[PDB]
Coordinates of C-alpha atoms in Angstrom, one line a residue:
Chain A
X1 CA -26.6 31.8 -16.9
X2 CA -28.7 29.2 -18.5
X3 CA -31.9 27.1 -17.7
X4 CA -33.0 23.6 -18.1
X5 CA -36.8 23.6 -17.3
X6 CA -38.7 20.4 -16.5
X7 CA -42.3 19.8 -17.8
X8 CA -43.3 18.0 -14.7
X9 CA -42.0 15.6 -12.1
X10 CA -44.5 12.7 -12.0
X11 CA -42.4 10.1 -10.1
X12 CA -40.3 10.4 -7.0
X13 CA -36.7 10.8 -8.1
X14 CA -33.3 12.0 -7.0
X15 CA -32.1 14.6 -9.6
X16 CA -28.4 15.4 -10.0
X17 CA -26.9 18.4 -11.8
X18 CA -23.1 18.0 -12.0
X19 CA -21.9 17.1 -8.5
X20 CA -25.1 18.6 -6.9
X21 CA -28.3 16.6 -6.2
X22 CA -31.9 17.1 -4.9
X23 CA -34.8 14.7 -3.9
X24 CA -38.0 15.4 -5.7
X25 CA -41.3 13.9 -4.6
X26 CA -43.9 12.3 -6.7
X27 CA -45.8 15.1 -8.5
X28 CA -43.9 17.8 -6.6
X29 CA -44.1 21.1 -8.6
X30 CA -40.5 21.0 -9.8
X31 CA -39.9 22.8 -13.1
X32 CA -36.2 23.0 -13.8
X33 CA -32.7 24.1 -12.8
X34 CA -31.6 27.8 -13.4
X35 CA -28.4 29.7 -13.2
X36 CA -26.4 26.9 -14.8
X37 CA -22.9 28.3 -15.5
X38 CA -22.3 28.8 -19.2
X39 CA -18.9 27.6 -20.5
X40 CA -18.5 24.0 -19.5
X41 CA -20.4 20.7 -20.2
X42 CA -22.9 19.6 -17.7
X43 CA -24.7 16.4 -16.7
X44 CA -28.2 16.1 -15.3
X45 CA -29.0 12.6 -14.0
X46 CA -31.6 10.5 -12.3
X47 CA -32.3 7.7 -9.9
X48 CA -35.9 6.7 -9.3
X49 CA -37.0 6.3 -5.7
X50 CA -38.3 3.0 -6.7
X51 CA -35.4 1.6 -8.8
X52 CA -32.0 2.4 -7.1
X53 CA -30.7 0.4 -10.1
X54 CA -30.0 2.2 -13.4
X55 CA -28.8 5.7 -12.7
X56 CA -29.0 7.6 -16.0
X57 CA -28.4 11.0 -17.3
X58 CA -27.8 13.6 -20.1
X59 CA -24.5 15.4 -20.9
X60 CA -25.2 18.7 -22.4
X61 CA -23.8 22.1 -23.2
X62 CA -26.4 25.0 -23.1
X63 CA -24.5 26.9 -25.8
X64 CA -25.6 24.2 -28.3
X65 CA -29.3 24.7 -27.7
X66 CA -32.3 25.1 -25.4
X67 CA -32.8 21.7 -23.6
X68 CA -35.6 20.6 -21.2
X69 CA -36.6 17.5 -19.3
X70 CA -39.8 15.6 -19.8
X71 CA -41.0 12.4 -18.2
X72 CA -42.1 9.8 -20.7
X73 CA -44.6 7.4 -19.0
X74 CA -44.3 4.8 -21.9
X75 CA -40.5 4.4 -21.6
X76 CA -40.6 5.2 -17.9
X77 CA -37.9 7.8 -17.6
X78 CA -36.9 11.5 -17.7
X79 CA -35.9 12.4 -21.2
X80 CA -33.9 15.4 -22.3
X81 CA -35.4 17.1 -25.4
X82 CA -34.6 20.2 -27.5
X83 CA -37.0 23.1 -28.0
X84 CA -36.2 24.6 -31.4
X85 CA -38.7 27.5 -30.8
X86 CA -36.5 30.1 -29.1
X87 CA -39.4 32.4 -28.2
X88 CA -41.6 29.6 -26.9
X89 CA -38.6 28.4 -24.7
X90 CA -37.8 31.8 -23.1
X91 CA -41.5 32.1 -22.4
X92 CA -41.8 28.7 -20.5
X93 CA -38.5 29.5 -18.7
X94 CA -39.5 33.1 -17.7
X95 CA -42.9 32.0 -16.4
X96 CA -41.4 29.2 -14.3
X97 CA -38.9 31.6 -12.7
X98 CA -41.7 34.1 -12.2
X99 CA -43.6 31.3 -10.3
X100 CA -40.2 30.5 -8.7
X101 CA -40.5 26.8 -9.2
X102 CA -36.8 26.3 -10.1
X103 CA -33.8 25.3 -8.2
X104 CA -30.6 27.5 -8.6
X105 CA -27.4 25.7 -9.7
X106 CA -25.8 25.9 -6.2
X107 CA -22.2 27.1 -7.1
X108 CA -20.1 28.5 -4.4
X109 CA -18.0 31.2 -6.1
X110 CA -14.7 30.0 -4.5
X111 CA -15.3 26.5 -5.9
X112 CA -13.5 25.3 -9.1
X113 CA -14.5 21.7 -8.6
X114 CA -16.6 21.4 -11.6
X115 CA -14.2 23.2 -13.8
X116 CA -11.3 21.1 -12.5
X117 CA -13.3 17.9 -13.2
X118 CA -14.3 19.0 -16.7
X119 CA -11.3 21.2 -17.8
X120 CA -10.6 19.1 -21.0
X121 CA -14.2 17.8 -21.6
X122 CA -15.6 18.9 -24.9
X123 CA -19.2 18.3 -25.9
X124 CA -18.1 17.4 -29.5
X125 CA -15.8 14.6 -28.3
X126 CA -18.6 13.2 -26.0
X127 CA -20.9 12.9 -29.0
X128 CA -18.3 10.8 -30.7
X129 CA -18.1 8.4 -27.7
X130 CA -22.0 8.4 -27.4
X131 CA -22.9 8.3 -31.1
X132 CA -26.5 9.5 -31.5
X133 CA -26.2 12.3 -33.9
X134 CA -29.9 13.4 -34.0
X135 CA -29.5 14.8 -30.5
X136 CA -27.2 17.5 -29.3
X137 CA -27.0 16.0 -25.8
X138 CA -25.9 12.5 -24.8
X139 CA -27.6 9.7 -22.8
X140 CA -25.5 7.6 -20.5
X141 CA -26.6 5.0 -17.9
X142 CA -25.4 2.4 -15.4
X143 CA -25.6 -0.5 -17.6
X144 CA -24.1 0.8 -20.9
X145 CA -21.2 -1.3 -22.1
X146 CA -18.0 -0.1 -23.9
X147 CA -16.8 -1.1 -27.3
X148 CA -13.8 -3.0 -25.8
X149 CA -16.1 -4.8 -23.4
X150 CA -18.4 -5.8 -26.4
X151 CA -15.4 -7.4 -28.2
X152 CA -14.7 -9.7 -25.3
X153 CA -23.5 -6.7 -28.2
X154 CA -25.8 -3.7 -29.3
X155 CA -23.5 -1.1 -30.9
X156 CA -26.2 1.7 -30.9
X157 CA -25.9 1.8 -27.0
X158 CA -22.1 1.5 -26.9
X159 CA -19.5 3.8 -25.2
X160 CA -17.0 4.2 -28.1
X161 CA -14.0 4.9 -25.9
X162 CA -10.6 4.5 -27.4
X163 CA -9.4 0.9 -27.0
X164 CA -6.3 0.6 -25.0
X165 CA -4.7 -2.8 -24.5
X166 CA -1.2 -3.4 -23.3
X167 CA -0.8 -6.9 -25.0
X168 CA -1.6 -5.9 -28.6
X169 CA 0.2 -5.4 -31.8
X170 CA -0.8 -1.8 -31.5
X171 CA 1.0 -1.3 -28.1
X172 CA 4.1 -3.4 -29.1
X173 CA 6.5 -2.9 -31.9
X174 CA 8.0 -6.1 -33.4
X175 CA 11.5 -6.2 -32.2
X176 CA 10.9 -4.0 -29.1
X177 CA 8.7 -6.5 -27.4
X178 CA 10.3 -6.2 -24.0
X179 CA 11.1 -2.5 -24.3
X180 CA 7.7 -1.4 -25.3
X181 CA 5.9 -3.6 -22.8
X182 CA 8.0 -2.3 -19.8
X183 CA 8.1 1.2 -21.1
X184 CA 4.9 2.2 -22.9
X185 CA 6.3 5.6 -24.0
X186 CA 5.9 4.7 -27.7
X187 CA 2.3 3.6 -27.2
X188 CA 1.4 6.7 -25.3
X189 CA 3.2 9.4 -27.3
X190 CA 3.4 8.1 -30.9
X191 CA 0.4 5.7 -31.1
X192 CA -2.1 7.4 -28.7
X193 CA -1.1 11.1 -28.4
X194 CA 0.3 11.9 -31.8
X195 CA -1.7 9.2 -33.6
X196 CA -5.3 9.0 -32.3
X197 CA -5.9 11.8 -29.8
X198 CA -3.8 14.3 -31.7
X199 CA -3.0 16.3 -28.4
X200 CA -3.0 15.8 -24.7
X201 CA -6.2 17.8 -24.1
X202 CA -8.5 15.4 -25.9
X203 CA -6.7 12.5 -24.2
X204 CA -7.3 14.2 -20.8
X205 CA -10.9 15.0 -22.0
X206 CA -11.7 11.3 -22.5
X207 CA -10.0 10.4 -19.3
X208 CA -12.1 12.9 -17.4
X209 CA -15.3 11.9 -19.2
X210 CA -14.7 8.2 -18.3
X211 CA -14.1 9.0 -14.7
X212 CA -17.4 11.1 -14.4
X213 CA -19.4 8.3 -16.1
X214 CA -18.1 5.9 -13.5
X215 CA -18.7 8.2 -10.7
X216 CA -22.1 9.4 -11.6
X217 CA -23.5 6.2 -13.1
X218 CA -21.3 3.5 -11.7
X219 CA -20.6 2.6 -15.3
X220 CA -18.0 -0.2 -14.9
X221 CA -16.6 0.1 -18.4
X222 CA -15.9 3.7 -17.8
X223 CA -14.0 2.9 -14.6
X224 CA -11.9 0.4 -16.6
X225 CA -11.2 3.0 -19.2
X226 CA -10.2 5.7 -16.7
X227 CA -7.7 3.3 -15.0
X228 CA -6.4 2.3 -18.3
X229 CA -5.6 5.9 -19.3
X230 CA -3.9 6.6 -16.0
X231 CA -1.8 3.4 -16.3
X232 CA -0.7 4.1 -19.9
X233 CA 0.7 7.5 -18.7
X234 CA 2.3 6.2 -15.4
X235 CA 3.8 3.2 -17.3
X236 CA 5.7 5.6 -19.7
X237 CA 9.2 6.6 -18.8
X238 CA 8.9 9.6 -21.1
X239 CA 5.9 12.0 -20.7
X240 CA 5.8 15.7 -21.4
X241 CA 6.4 17.6 -18.2
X242 CA 3.1 19.6 -18.8
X243 CA 1.1 16.4 -18.9
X244 CA 2.5 15.1 -15.6
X245 CA 1.7 18.1 -13.7
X246 CA -1.8 18.5 -15.2
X247 CA -2.5 14.8 -14.5
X248 CA -1.7 15.3 -10.8
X249 CA -4.2 18.1 -10.7
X250 CA -6.8 16.1 -12.7
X251 CA -6.6 13.0 -10.4
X252 CA -6.5 15.1 -7.3
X253 CA -9.9 16.7 -8.0
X254 CA -11.2 13.1 -9.1
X255 CA -10.1 11.5 -5.8
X256 CA -11.3 14.5 -4.0
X257 CA -14.8 14.4 -5.5
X258 CA -15.4 10.7 -5.1
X259 CA -17.9 9.5 -2.5
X260 CA -15.9 8.2 0.4
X261 CA -18.0 5.1 0.6
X262 CA -17.5 4.1 -3.1
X263 CA -13.7 3.7 -3.0
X264 CA -14.0 -0.1 -3.2
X265 CA -15.4 -0.6 -6.7
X266 CA -14.2 2.7 -8.3
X267 CA -10.5 2.5 -7.4
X268 CA -8.4 -0.4 -8.8
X269 CA -6.0 -1.3 -6.2
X270 CA -3.4 -2.7 -8.6
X271 CA -3.4 0.3 -10.9
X272 CA -3.1 2.8 -8.1
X273 CA -0.3 1.1 -6.1
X274 CA 1.5 0.7 -9.4
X275 CA 1.1 4.3 -10.5
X276 CA 1.9 5.9 -7.1
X277 CA 4.6 3.6 -5.9
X278 CA 6.0 1.3 -8.6
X279 CA 5.8 3.2 -11.9
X280 CA 8.1 5.5 -13.7
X281 CA 5.9 8.4 -12.6
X282 CA 5.7 7.5 -9.0
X283 CA 7.5 10.7 -8.0
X284 CA 5.4 12.9 -10.3
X285 CA 1.9 12.8 -8.6
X286 CA 2.7 14.4 -5.3
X287 CA -0.8 15.9 -4.8
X288 CA -2.5 12.8 -5.9
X289 CA -0.3 10.7 -3.8
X290 CA -0.9 12.9 -0.7
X291 CA -4.6 13.0 -0.9
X292 CA -4.8 9.2 -1.6
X293 CA -2.7 8.3 1.6
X294 CA -4.7 10.7 3.9
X295 CA -8.1 9.5 2.7
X296 CA -7.7 6.0 1.6
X297 CA -4.6 4.5 3.2
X298 CA -6.4 1.1 3.4
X299 CA -6.4 0.6 -0.4
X300 CA -2.6 1.1 -0.2
Chain B
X1 CA -6.7 -22.2 -18.2
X2 CA -4.1 -23.5 -15.8
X3 CA -2.8 -27.1 -16.1
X4 CA -3.2 -29.3 -13.0
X5 CA -4.1 -32.9 -11.8
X6 CA -7.6 -32.7 -13.1
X7 CA -6.7 -32.1 -16.7
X8 CA -3.5 -34.1 -16.8
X9 CA -4.3 -36.5 -19.6
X10 CA -4.8 -33.6 -22.0
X11 CA -1.0 -33.7 -22.3
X12 CA -1.2 -37.0 -24.3
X13 CA -4.1 -36.1 -26.7
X14 CA -3.4 -35.3 -30.3
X15 CA -3.4 -31.5 -29.9
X16 CA 0.3 -30.4 -30.3
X17 CA 1.7 -28.7 -27.2
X18 CA 4.9 -27.8 -25.6
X19 CA 6.1 -27.2 -22.1
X20 CA 8.6 -24.3 -21.8
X21 CA 10.9 -24.2 -18.7
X22 CA 13.2 -21.3 -18.2
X23 CA 14.8 -22.3 -14.9
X24 CA 18.2 -23.0 -16.6
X25 CA 18.3 -20.0 -19.0
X26 CA 20.3 -17.6 -16.7
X27 CA 22.8 -19.6 -14.7
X28 CA 25.5 -18.0 -12.5
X29 CA 28.2 -18.9 -10.0
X30 CA 28.5 -16.6 -7.0
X31 CA 32.0 -15.8 -5.8
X32 CA 34.0 -13.2 -3.8
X33 CA 36.1 -10.4 -5.3
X34 CA 39.6 -9.4 -4.3
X35 CA 38.0 -6.4 -2.4
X36 CA 35.7 -8.9 -0.8
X37 CA 32.5 -8.0 -2.6
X38 CA 30.3 -10.6 -4.1
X39 CA 30.1 -10.9 -7.9
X40 CA 28.3 -13.4 -10.2
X41 CA 29.9 -15.1 -13.2
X42 CA 27.4 -16.5 -15.8
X43 CA 27.7 -19.8 -17.4
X44 CA 25.9 -21.3 -20.4
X45 CA 22.3 -22.0 -20.0
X46 CA 19.3 -23.6 -21.9
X47 CA 15.6 -23.2 -22.6
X48 CA 13.9 -26.7 -22.0
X49 CA 11.2 -26.9 -24.6
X50 CA 9.5 -30.4 -24.7
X51 CA 6.6 -32.0 -26.4
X52 CA 5.3 -34.4 -23.7
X53 CA 3.4 -36.5 -26.3
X54 CA 6.4 -37.2 -28.7
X55 CA 9.4 -36.6 -26.5
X56 CA 10.8 -34.2 -29.0
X57 CA 13.0 -31.9 -27.0
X58 CA 14.1 -28.5 -28.4
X59 CA 17.2 -27.7 -26.3
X60 CA 18.1 -24.0 -27.1
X61 CA 21.4 -23.2 -25.7
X62 CA 21.9 -19.8 -24.2
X63 CA 25.4 -18.7 -24.6
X64 CA 26.9 -16.5 -22.0
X65 CA 27.6 -13.8 -24.6
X66 CA 23.9 -13.0 -24.7
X67 CA 24.2 -11.3 -21.3
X68 CA 27.1 -9.0 -22.2
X69 CA 26.5 -5.4 -21.2
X70 CA 22.9 -6.2 -20.0
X71 CA 21.2 -5.1 -16.8
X72 CA 18.3 -6.9 -14.9
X73 CA 19.5 -10.2 -16.4
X74 CA 17.0 -12.3 -14.5
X75 CA 14.2 -10.1 -16.0
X76 CA 15.9 -10.2 -19.4
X77 CA 16.1 -14.0 -19.3
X78 CA 12.3 -14.3 -19.4
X79 CA 12.1 -12.1 -22.5
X80 CA 15.0 -14.0 -24.2
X81 CA 13.2 -17.3 -23.5
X82 CA 10.0 -15.9 -25.0
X83 CA 11.9 -14.5 -28.0
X84 CA 13.6 -17.9 -28.6
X85 CA 10.3 -19.8 -28.1
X86 CA 8.6 -17.6 -30.6
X87 CA 11.3 -17.9 -33.2
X88 CA 11.2 -21.7 -32.7
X89 CA 7.4 -21.6 -33.4
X90 CA 8.0 -19.4 -36.4
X91 CA 10.6 -21.9 -37.7
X92 CA 8.2 -24.8 -37.6
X93 CA 5.8 -25.6 -40.5
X94 CA 2.2 -24.6 -39.8
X95 CA 1.0 -28.2 -39.2
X96 CA 3.8 -28.6 -36.7
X97 CA 3.3 -25.4 -34.6
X98 CA 1.7 -26.1 -31.2
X99 CA -1.8 -25.2 -30.3
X100 CA -0.8 -24.6 -26.7
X101 CA 2.3 -23.7 -24.9
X102 CA 2.5 -24.5 -21.2
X103 CA 5.0 -22.4 -19.1
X104 CA 6.3 -24.0 -15.9
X105 CA 6.6 -20.7 -14.2
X106 CA 4.0 -18.0 -14.3
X107 CA 6.5 -15.3 -14.6
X108 CA 6.9 -16.4 -18.3
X109 CA 3.3 -15.7 -19.2
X110 CA 3.5 -11.9 -20.1
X111 CA 6.8 -12.3 -22.0
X112 CA 5.6 -15.2 -24.0
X113 CA 2.2 -13.7 -24.7
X114 CA 3.8 -10.5 -25.9
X115 CA 6.2 -12.4 -28.1
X116 CA 3.4 -14.6 -29.5
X117 CA 1.1 -11.8 -30.4
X118 CA 1.6 -13.0 -34.0
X119 CA 0.0 -16.3 -33.0
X120 CA -3.3 -15.5 -31.4
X121 CA -4.7 -19.0 -31.8
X122 CA -1.8 -20.4 -29.7
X123 CA -2.9 -20.5 -26.1
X124 CA -0.3 -19.7 -23.5
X125 CA -1.1 -21.4 -20.2
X126 CA 0.3 -21.6 -16.7
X127 CA 0.4 -24.8 -14.7
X128 CA -0.1 -25.8 -11.1
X129 CA 2.0 -28.9 -11.3
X130 CA 5.4 -28.8 -9.7
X131 CA 7.3 -30.2 -12.7
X132 CA 11.0 -31.1 -12.1
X133 CA 12.3 -29.8 -15.4
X134 CA 15.1 -27.8 -13.7
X135 CA 16.9 -31.1 -13.2
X136 CA 17.4 -31.3 -17.0
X137 CA 21.0 -30.3 -16.3
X138 CA 21.4 -33.4 -14.3
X139 CA 21.2 -35.4 -17.5
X140 CA 24.9 -35.7 -18.3
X141 CA 24.5 -35.5 -22.1
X142 CA 22.4 -32.3 -21.8
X143 CA 24.7 -30.7 -19.4
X144 CA 27.7 -31.6 -21.6
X145 CA 26.4 -30.0 -24.8
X146 CA 25.3 -26.9 -22.9
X147 CA 28.6 -26.4 -21.2
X148 CA 30.7 -27.1 -24.3
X149 CA 28.9 -24.7 -26.6
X150 CA 30.8 -21.7 -28.1
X151 CA 27.8 -19.9 -29.6
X152 CA 24.0 -19.9 -29.6
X153 CA 23.0 -23.4 -30.7
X154 CA 19.8 -25.4 -30.9
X155 CA 20.1 -29.1 -30.2
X156 CA 17.3 -31.6 -30.7
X157 CA 16.8 -34.8 -28.6
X158 CA 14.1 -37.3 -27.9
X159 CA 13.9 -37.1 -24.2
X160 CA 12.2 -40.6 -24.1
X161 CA 14.9 -42.4 -26.1
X162 CA 13.0 -45.3 -27.6
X163 CA 10.6 -45.9 -24.7
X164 CA 7.5 -45.1 -26.9
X165 CA 8.3 -48.2 -29.0
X166 CA 6.9 -50.0 -26.0
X167 CA 5.1 -47.8 -23.6
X168 CA 2.5 -44.9 -24.0
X169 CA 3.2 -41.2 -23.8
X170 CA 1.4 -41.1 -20.5
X171 CA 3.7 -43.7 -19.1
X172 CA 6.8 -42.2 -20.6
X173 CA 6.1 -38.8 -19.1
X174 CA 5.6 -40.3 -15.7
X175 CA 8.9 -42.1 -16.0
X176 CA 10.6 -38.9 -17.1
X177 CA 9.2 -36.8 -14.3
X178 CA 10.0 -39.5 -11.8
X179 CA 13.6 -39.8 -12.9
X180 CA 14.0 -36.0 -12.9
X181 CA 12.3 -35.6 -9.6
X182 CA 14.8 -38.0 -8.1
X183 CA 17.8 -36.3 -9.7
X184 CA 16.4 -33.0 -8.3
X185 CA 15.9 -34.3 -4.7
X186 CA 19.3 -36.1 -4.5
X187 CA 21.4 -36.1 -7.6
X188 CA 24.2 -38.2 -6.4
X189 CA 22.0 -41.2 -5.3
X190 CA 19.7 -40.8 -8.3
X191 CA 22.7 -41.0 -10.7
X192 CA 24.2 -44.0 -8.7
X193 CA 20.9 -45.9 -9.1
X194 CA 21.1 -45.4 -13.0
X195 CA 24.7 -46.5 -13.5
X196 CA 25.5 -48.9 -10.7
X197 CA 25.6 -51.7 -13.2
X198 CA 28.2 -51.1 -15.9
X199 CA 26.7 -53.8 -18.1
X200 CA 23.7 -51.5 -19.0
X201 CA 24.9 -48.9 -21.4
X202 CA 23.5 -45.7 -22.8
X203 CA 23.3 -45.8 -26.6
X204 CA 25.2 -43.0 -28.4
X205 CA 21.9 -41.6 -29.7
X206 CA 20.2 -41.9 -26.3
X207 CA 20.0 -40.1 -23.0
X208 CA 19.3 -43.0 -20.5
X209 CA 20.5 -46.5 -20.2
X210 CA 19.0 -49.3 -22.2
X211 CA 17.1 -51.0 -19.4
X212 CA 14.9 -54.0 -20.1
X213 CA 11.3 -53.7 -19.1
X214 CA 11.9 -55.6 -15.9
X215 CA 15.0 -53.4 -15.1
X216 CA 12.9 -50.2 -15.5
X217 CA 10.5 -51.6 -12.9
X218 CA 13.4 -52.0 -10.4
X219 CA 14.8 -48.7 -11.4
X220 CA 11.4 -46.8 -10.9
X221 CA 11.0 -48.5 -7.5
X222 CA 14.5 -47.4 -6.5
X223 CA 13.7 -43.9 -7.6
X224 CA 10.5 -43.9 -5.7
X225 CA 12.2 -45.1 -2.5
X226 CA 14.8 -42.4 -2.9
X227 CA 12.2 -39.6 -3.2
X228 CA 10.3 -40.8 -0.1
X229 CA 13.4 -41.2 2.0
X230 CA 14.6 -37.7 1.1
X231 CA 11.2 -36.4 2.2
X232 CA 11.3 -37.8 5.8
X233 CA 14.9 -36.4 6.0
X234 CA 13.7 -33.0 4.9
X235 CA 10.8 -32.8 7.3
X236 CA 11.6 -35.2 10.1
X237 CA 8.5 -37.4 9.5

């Protein structure tokens, strides 16, 4: 079990840790989150009481270092930082526990939600999408734009997701125009899986990371990217059996976890009706199809 | 973006553009089989590729053999149209390649766009106009050359004959669309109007009779009256 202490909480903020969240009042003695399960990535995120715009947050993995939160009054936000002094950090942590000023990561033991949402997400891959190599954790917020969005401004703040585009030389082999555009199997397996991602797990990792960034920060480029990666798979006639079954599980827990009230901006009506009902893989997402119908029949 | 009444004169400026109409690319007859099932038989078709400014028509004839052993032929026809349009563009010298290609049916956008990926600066556009280019096979000489063909064949025409020697593109195109619209609404009458007088002949290098300026005015009025009559009949107005 690991800890992320907080120096103080000077401004009223809603704090999230993975799918859990707590209201913290202006200068309430809050000093961190304890019992954070080792072994997966995590994300701690924020929404100021005063500015319900710009949700922001930090992806991290406690194995990669000791990390803490500190409000910066110049920049006006909670900053993640690394303490390099191992002794000094266990000291701050232990004293805060002693004084019991920390919330416990509230995991029910039956619950695999966070594992099912972050199965294939690796901190090393995240840091290639959010390039900022002087930190071991990554910042994301509501407003950050993706590399593909920028093509159609500031690259330091860019989400460097893999660019997918169905009407591109990359996607379409000369001479197989019609074939490749109606059956994207060659884009998926040769170009994307074998070529760029190397394996299905990194592909699935970026897919899940994209979804989480959309859910947690309402990042619109990430939503676009999640839909694109679903569509690419569902629009391929030839997909490894193991990918299809895992996709159904992945999407199931994504649809499951989404706030009921946000279904309108986070779910692209075309893509889902296409994947569930029109595409090659319509018959291959039984769990995802069942939970979508019983929970959002209107979108369909 | 889309072509409509607002941006209509853009067709006559000096940016090269082409209309592509695919309505006569896959043509069938429908008949009954001995067992009583229905079957289609394909006949020869044509892509109608027209420069509205110059009248240069690029009639690509689609021989029935293209369909042999293929499924989802109406879907394939869109891709074969795009494949042949793109090859046409590739065949033209750079200075003659169009800056825009306007498809008369939106279903053609994705096929053409995918086939034109090598020409990113060629804009593919839909249109909101209800152009009558499907009636192109009502022009006897175009139908004849299509139906006679024994292989894939491109045939070049000037769809305006020699009109531009005396009228502007804008006016030429409005005559063409008006003639084709009449042929579409009531072919038999339309054709009667054009040929009633045996003394007005079609030159061998032309598609339409050699009317004098005054005679075109009478013709155009007769074609307008036709189109309006057929409307009241259609709708009981």
